[PDB]
């Protein structure tokens, strides 16, 4: 892992296999159609972030301070989501 920085609409539309991305600010995120396996985010922040479609597997969120985040279609549930601060977070749709 390498320390993450603050990216405006990162829209990292490529798939990741790295384990961790410790350090995150991610203001106005625009992630779309990214397939994480074995990926983790620790000590990360998300404001006005947007997830379109993530086929996440074995990936969990730790110490993530979501604020005003909409996920639309995702594989994220309490099972794949570790304890962390979430406010004004919405999960419109989910997949099996």
């Amino acid at each position: 892992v390498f320390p993450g920085e603050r990216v405006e609409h990162v829209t990292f539309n490529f798939t990741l296999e790295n384990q961790i991305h410790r350090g995150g600010q991610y203001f106005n995120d625009k992630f779309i159609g990214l397939r994480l396996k074995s990926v983790s985010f620790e000590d990360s922040l998300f404001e006005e972030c947007y997830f379109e479609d993530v086929t996440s597997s074995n990936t969990f969120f730790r110490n993530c301070t979501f604020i005003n985040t909409v996920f639309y279609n995702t594989d994220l549930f309490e099972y794949k989501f570790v304890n962390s601060r979430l406010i004004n977070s919405t999960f419109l749709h989910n997949k099996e």
Epitope: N28, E47, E48, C49, Y50, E52, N68, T69, V70, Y72, T90, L92
Partner: nanobody, 119 residues
Framework: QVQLVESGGGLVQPGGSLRLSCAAS????????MGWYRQAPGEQRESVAS???????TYADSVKGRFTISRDNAKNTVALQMNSLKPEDTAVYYC?????????????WGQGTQVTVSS
């Protein structure tokens, strides 16, 4: 604030169909156009389906061969084509909009419309 429009409630027979059309106006900036949810007596809203962005869609597995979604962005509308309306599966149907503007994500909900089944 985006004004959303709800419609299409009432009695339909199994084998018949209804068009529940979502529409919205004001402050629309290439939005994810309203998808559909089913509200039961119990406090909860089941996902139905969405064709909100691009030409792609996700339908719930629970609505396979029952709820079909078609979208016309040039109009900011979504049409739910209700079919296979088995008598027990009634609900209040809701439009769920997502704002993709410069101030970040925002969402809107309508009051919903009640659909029942004729027999």
């Amino acid at each position: 604030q985006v004004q959303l429009v709800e419609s299409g409630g009432g009695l339909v027979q199994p084998g018949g169909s209804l068009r529940l059309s979502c529409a919205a106006s004001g402050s629309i900036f290439n939005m994810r156009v309203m998808g559909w949810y089913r509200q039961a007596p119990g406090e909860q809203r089941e996902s139905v389906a969405s064709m909100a962005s691009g030409d792609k869609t996700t339908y719930a597995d629970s609505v396979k061969g029952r709820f079909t979604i078609s979208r016309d962005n040039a109009k900011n509308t979504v049409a739910l084509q209700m079919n296979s309306l088995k008598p027990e599966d009634t609900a209040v149907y809701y439009c769920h909009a997502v704002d993709l503007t410069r101030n970040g994500p925002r969402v809107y909900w309508g009051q919903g419309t009640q659909v029942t089944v004729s027999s």
